[PDB]
Paper text:
We sought to use our protocol to design a human transferrin receptor (hTfR) binding protein. hTfR transports transferrin (the major carrier of iron in the body) across the blood–brain barrier (BBB) via receptor mediated transcytosis, and this process has been exploited to deliver therapeutic payloads into the brain parenchyma that would otherwise be blocked by the BBB. We developed a computational design approach for designing binding proteins with beta sheets geometrically poised to pair with exposed beta strands in target proteins of interest. We targeted the region surrounding an edge strand located in the hTfR apical domain. This domain is distant from the transferrin binding site (which is important to avoid competitive binding) and is exposed and therefore suitable for beta sheet extension.
Combination of these enriched substitutions yielded higher affinity variants. The crystal structures of two increased affinity variants (2DS25.1 and 2DS25.5) in complex with hTfR were determined to be resolutions of 3.1 and 2.8 Å, respectively. The structures are virtually identical with an rmsd of 0.26 Å. In both cases, the design binds the Apical domain of hTfR using beta sheet extension and overall closely resembles the computational design model. The structure of 2DS25 superimposes closely on the computational model with an rmsd of 1.2 Å; this is notable as the fold is more complex than that of previous computationally designed binders. The majority of the mutants that improved binding map to the interface between hTfR and 2DS25 and likely optimize packing interactions and electrostatic contacts. Biolayer interferometry of five variants revealed KD’s ranging from 20 to 400 nM. Following injection of three Alexa488 labeled designs spanning two orders of magnitude in KD (2DS25 2 μM, 2DS25.3 200 nM, and 2DS25.5 20 nM) into the vascular channel, we observed transport of 2DS25.3 and 2DS25.5 into the CNS channel. Transport across the BBB was slightly higher for 2DS25.5 (Kd 20 nM) compared to 2DS25.3 (Kd 200 nM). An interface knockout (KO) variant of 2DS25 showed lower penetration into the CNS channel than 2DS25.3 and 2DS25.5, indicating the transport was specific.
Author numbering:
A (entry chain A): 121 to 759
B (entry chain C), D (entry chain D): 1 to 88
C (entry chain B): 121 to 760
The structure:
């Protein structure tokens, strides 16, 4: 029999004998490039991954076939033009090679106002209003969809996105790039339900689709526009010197976007290594396969890591006697640049089949972007698992352990809309984890035509060792979640997550006292959840691990923790991100805090009735999670 | 081609399209640098000869009070744009 | 060790030694007779039930306190008046004693049009339009809430409900009765969430609340109104000869309702006998305790059956060595005639704790209303069980087995809004069952002051043996749901259900092809569900019943069948009855069929966009249930 | 208790309440059987004597063009209503 100390050294020894640069630059050949969603080369790479899964002698390989509507450029060229002197002077700024998917096809003419990164606080700290004008924004900080939503909320008629040289130091300055403006995930025309032929594709439009045109432009076109506008950009923004603010008096900008929808067939490839004790429970390891350009950083590294992890685990189970108690699923997704279309539609299709079976998701997308920092975003249940993993995995260049900051958990940022783990965590209620070796600045070539293998190996010479470290982190994650009778999910991690929330809410106690309300029941629910976690820990400690009955009874209560945080009072179709902690909508705790923060201004932006309903529903969501983790229904106490 | 642009402008102006939106359509369809709508052919000759004097690399054509200037670089495009703004 | 054949006759021997009429007429003593929801005598009866549960020495006895808003009469009397000659002739019709809770407090004046029972077909087959007029209807067929909703949908300004002598043969022509008109369950001011102090009771109103006044009147007042009306009521209604249709031209009716809201504290009493093998899984046996009047037929019989079943099962566990594998929960609810307030609020409060633990609910309300027929309304998963209980339980009077009709399953009516098992089945996805020894006519004294023990013992002389038979049915249900390693839940039954649905849908093939759609994927979904049921049956057959882990895993696969039929695309707060088969809303299969009907009519009623989304979500709901029942996600082998 | 009903009718008529809604308020407050609004007091006395002749068990009181009839049974209530309809 093998224990953790042997599995770890076996995984490390197999990692030392594996080359990742070869597989990456093979995925960067002239077969497979470029691989847009639904393209022929994406299908070729899907078939290659499927046949490689077959070669690894996995327990079972299969495929899912979806038909989704994406958006592409039309025969008519998108245009950015400058008009002057009441339309008697026209100036072609750019015919961009890139575009923003799911943008509304229209033409709009008006003034161009700069809004920095397009965040809500950026629009708040602006003197020039953007109502009925086009907005120029630089990329970064938030997703394209968030920028377009924040602009459209203030009656902006158009959005232009560029890359400044200060945050994106690119020599070319005429490079085009690609993104999507859908404020959500999955096929925006099958919102909440899968994209299969069974649905017969009824008329359904996601509310996350924008109703204003958004277009990407190069830095050359951005500076060309800057040459026709006035006002110095604030030094707080840290942008180029050529930056300007608002167009001239008589100068207007005309933006013409003519993108068209296209129905395509995407393929999700899957392999599974069945468990030896509890095969019905499993971890899912996914990676995006498609990419607008070459996509070496985002999709190539992830797909190579997926292939090599599958190969190594199959070799361990077939030749080295590794016997996981629970199953392992390796998934190659498609259409990952229009949101998380493949993964989200797969979740929406088989949601009832993986309800309380799939218990962890590990995303491998964009895992190698630098060598300075090791960043991670995950559900609290995995925090400890991450911590114990950072204490015994060495840095690729410095040679030291990844665990250096003892307060890393207090600095973890939550998953964002562009990450494929976000629909796994906020929609399906499955704990998900994404990690990356990156830098303090964004990878400049993401979404561009220069996201190639040569530009990636030149920026990262030790790419093999960094990819090996990322694969080692992922492999230790997989082993810790499958090899032992105890699942390494730390429920107590949520206690602090609750303890902060109420405390934040307590900072507005006076408001709570002015509306005749009280926070005592939220404190009661938090304490009940804390005591339930403590009782569960003590029962785990007092139970014999060889008794399968009691162990499964406890693990079922462990695997229900993340599900009980999904809001049971909202529609999963019109509000799929149901998680009260990491979701999106008025049902989340951050939304409750946002609403309550508006009362003291006394302007009519605070909705008290909405706030009371939010308080009630969130309080009882926390209390129901606590009562479900407590145990049987007849062991709950009342006043 | 000069004749192609001339025939397109002719067909568009006879259809009822005003000069300004016709210039917008021209710059959308032919990927030209700058188009100027002038009041008479005097302004047309003035602006055309000015742009050809200060930017000899530009391809300038005049037709029906519309002066279309086509260049193939961005610096020369900015030069033509500034010259057209000054000469207007 | 004990087997089923021993437990059967031991339960029977305890049934023969149990007296039910004693406890019934004890619950009908002056210490408890008028137990309105939240009253003092309701609280005393709850205390008595709790002390009796403690005396039986159950595994645990506890209680839950809810604070809910009901509606009660005001100091000002509700009035029905007739005015004539432009208000110069005033005629007092009635100051009724009963009322309809959750009615809108208002005063309306207008014409009075008879609409039979107030069903949608009654309003459709009506010559006189009811828009802007008051509607008088008869009690029966549907609930009060359905009548008021169907009236308000056609712009009716008021509703009057009475009891005709043909349908309700009562001598007292001035008898009052009580009802409620909330189109839903639970506290209508905490819709979708429990009624606890933790929620702090935010301003939220259920959409099922009516916006027109509705009042109950006696037969004398109804005939007095008919004396001022014209037109003979159609012979298809089978009503009294004094029935009339429409008031005179110059005569109008004034209805004044002034009911007021009242916040009350309701108590739900619970006892639990813990299991010996799988104590975390359990069935729930509930019974309404409160009633507007004496409530001997509705709540008294149910509470007596609950007490006696608890006592007998506790005796079998403590004295006869009966070891249930799974737990048993006996529940006495409150506020059971204002909807299903107690049980619905309990479900909304502890839904996360009963997700995949509570696997069957057995309702005891109104189980003894007659001796002629034995009626049953339940989820198909219990059908087989019910059948297996009708083949060895004898009739209290005829002495023959209850299983006489071999095609009873094709004649089963679905649970209705007034039944307490409806929120258990349609909202929480728990298989539920309701049964009753009744007659072909409704019990006339339900909801009246004549629902006493005397009238019940006069109408049913052998009340003791009929109650014993009902308790035997419930006890056999519990025993076969608790004693063995198999739950005796027949999933294959749902196959038949699906086979019905598609069949009806085939009747509209010409329309489906006319919209450019196809039914092949729904055919494939039905076939895949059949295949999944067959695979689960073979897995049960090939697994050895002594292996508790594999058996519990298969039973976990079984306990997810009813849950996977809850629509995952609607809001459980604003559409709680999510069950696509037995719920309510545009997400159900009957709603899909009813909407598709209008395709042939070619008028504006058919919403093609809605139908396309309905067909898509319903098709994948069935396909998702089949894929989940098949097994693991990687073992789904079907042509996609 | 005829005179309290009379006081109520008088005080309600002085507050501006019309005779018809005053009759409705009277039948709502005192639970009387029938109220009749007459044009003059000769017709009032005539209708009151008619009701007294054909329903002698009824209590009939006349005040300010309002005739209030009170009975305690439903047969006599319907008889009073029909007599008021017939004699109106
Ligand atoms: C959870 O939520 C429920 C529903 O909102 C709350 O229940 C209400 O709680 C309030 C506050 O305790 C109750 O209001 C108080 O009720 C007392 C009950 O006394 C009864 O008996 C006396 C005779 O002895 C009667 O006169 C009285 O009408 C009652 O029938 C009253 O005694 C209280 O009056 C005193 O306090 C008030 C101010 O609170 C003063 O104005 C009075 O002069 C007097 O000093 C008061 O009326 C209310 O009745 C409860 N409703 C129900 C339906 O139970 C729960 O309190 C809440 N729980 C928690 C922990 O917050
Ligand atoms: C499931 O739905 C998808 C999408 O609706 C179907 O794919 C589509 O199938 C049709 C008919 O087979 C294709 O149309 C045909 O295209 C060819 C050109 O390749 C043309 O010559 C024909 O006249 C016809 O128009 C359509 O292209 C295709 N779309 C995609 C994106 O592949 C699929 O067939 C459906 N599957 C089943 C089993 O119904
Ligand atoms: C953006 O909003 C402002 C609102 O002030 C508009 O400015 C004008 O403001 C005056 C008030 O001093 C109003 O009387 C005018 O009606 C406003 N103009 C219009 C067109 O509504 C400003 O015009 C708005 N900009 C756009 C593009 O709609
Ligand atoms: C405050 O929030 C409530 C609830 O979100 C809003 O009430 C809804 O308003 C819309 C449009 O007015 C209606 O269609 C809904 O039916 C309302 N919901 C109800 C009644 O439950 C309310 O409008 C918000 N107020 C403001 C000023 O934004
Ligand atoms: C019920 O609805 C009908 C139809 O709308 C009403 O009858 C019409 O009333 C309008 C006045 O609003 C007249 O102009 C039409 O001539 C009427 N149509 C017919 C066929 O008579 C009717 O008044 C409504 N009833 C009530 C009580 O409001
Ligand atoms: C037909 O059904 C559709 C879908 O249920 C209805 O569309 C809704 O319309 C309201 C009103 O504008 C919107 O608030 C909803 O968001 C729409 N939902 C969808 C899914 O589109 C439509 O109104 C219905 N039409 C009729 C005549 O009943
Ligand atoms: Ca979607
Ligand atoms: Ca409720």
């Amino acid at each position: 029999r093998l224990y953790w100390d042997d599995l770890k050294r076996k995984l490390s020894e197999k990692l030392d004998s594996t080359d990742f640069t070869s597989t990456i630059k093979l995925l960067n050949e002239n077969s497979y490039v470029p691989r847009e969603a639904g393209s022929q080369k994406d299908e070729n790479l899907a078939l290659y991954v499927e046949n490689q899964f077959r070669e690894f002698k996995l327990s079972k390989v299969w495929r899912d076939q979806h038909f989704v509507k994406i958006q592409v450029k039309d025969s008519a060229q998108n245009s950015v033009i400058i008009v002057d002197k009441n339309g008697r002077l026209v100036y072609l700024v750019e015919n961009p090679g890139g575009y923003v998917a799911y943008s509304k096809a229209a033409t709009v003419t008006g003034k161009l106002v700069h809004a920095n990164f397009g965040t809500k606080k950026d629009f708040e700290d602006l003197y020039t209003p953007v109502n009925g004008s086009i907005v120029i924004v630089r990329a970064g900080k938030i997703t394209f969809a968030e920028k377009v939503a924040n602009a459209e909320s203030l009656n902006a008629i158009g959005v232009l996105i560029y890359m400044d040289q200060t945050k994106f130091p690119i020599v070319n300055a005429e490079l085009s790039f690609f993104g999507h403006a859908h404020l959500g995930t999955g096929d925006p025309y099958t919102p909440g339900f899968p994209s299969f032929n069974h649905t017969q594709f009824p008329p359904s439009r996601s509310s996350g689709l924008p109703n204003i045109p958004v277009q990407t432009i190069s830095r050359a076109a951005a500076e060309k526009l800057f040459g026709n506008m006035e006002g110095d950009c604030p030094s707080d923004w840290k942008t180029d010197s050529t930056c300007r603010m608002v167009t001239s008096e008589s100068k207007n900008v005309k933006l013409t976007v003519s993108n068209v929808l296209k129905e395509i067939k995407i393929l999700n490839i899957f392999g599974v290594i069945k468990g030896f004790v509890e095969p019905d429970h499993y971890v899912v390891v996914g990676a995006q396969r498609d990419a607008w350009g070459p996509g070496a950083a985002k999709s190539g590294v992830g797909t190579a890591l997926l292939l090599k992890l599958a190969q190594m685990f199959s070799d361990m189970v077939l030749k080295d006697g590794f016997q996981p108690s629970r199953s392992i699923i390796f998934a190659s997704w498609s259409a990952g640049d229009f949101g998380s279309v493949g993964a989200t539609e797969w979740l929406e299709g088989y949601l009832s089949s993986l309800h309380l079976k799939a218990f962890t998701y590990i995303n491998l997308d964009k895992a190698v972007l630098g060598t300075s920092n090791f960043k991670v975003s995950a559900s609290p249940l995995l925090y400890t698992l991450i911590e114990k993993t950072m204490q015994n995995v060495k840095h690729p260049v410095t040679g030291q352990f990844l665990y250096q900051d003892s307060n890393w958990a207090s600095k973890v940022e939550k998953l964002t809309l562009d990450n494929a783990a976000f629909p796994f965590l906020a929609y399906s209620g499955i704990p998900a984890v994404s990690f990356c070796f990156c830098e303090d600045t964004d990878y400049p070539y993401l979404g561009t035509t220069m996201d190639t293998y040569k530009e990636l190996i030149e920026r990262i010479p030790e790419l093999n060792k960094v990819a090996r470290a990322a694969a080692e982190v992922a492999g230790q994650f997989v082993i810790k979640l499958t090899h032992d009778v105890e699942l390494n999910l730390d429920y107590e991690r949520y206690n602090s997550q609750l303890l902060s929330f109420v405390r934040d809410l307590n900072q507005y106690r006076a408001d709570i006292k002015e509306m005749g309300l009280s926070l005592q029941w939220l404190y009661s629910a938090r304490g009940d959840f804390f005591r339930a976690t403590s009782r569960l820990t003590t029962d785990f400690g007092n139970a014999e691990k060889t008794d399968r009955f009691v162990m499964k009874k406890l693990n079922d209560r462990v695997m229900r923790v993340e599900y009980h945080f999904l809001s049971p009072y909202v529609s999963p179709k019109e509000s799929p991100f149901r998680h009260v902690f990491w979701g999106s909508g008025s049902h989340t705790l951050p939304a409750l805090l946002e609403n309550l923060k508006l009362r003291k201004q006394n302007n009519g932006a605070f909705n008290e009735t909405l706030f009371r309903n939010q308080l009630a529903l969130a309080t009882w969501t926390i209390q129901g999670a606590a009562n479900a983790l407590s145990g049987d229904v007849w062991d709950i106490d009342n006043e | 081609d000069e004749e192609e642009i001339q025939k397109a402008i002719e067909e568009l102006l006879r259809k009822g399209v005003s000069e300004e939106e016709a210039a917008i359509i021209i710059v959308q369809r032919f990927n030209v640098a700058v188009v100027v709508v002038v009041q008479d052919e005097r302004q047309g000759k003035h602006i055309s000869e000015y742009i050809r004097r200060y930017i000899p690399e530009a391809d300038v054509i005049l037709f029906a009070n519309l002066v279309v200037i086509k260049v193939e670089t961005h610096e020369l495009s900015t030069r033509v744009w500034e010259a057209a703004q000054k000469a207007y």
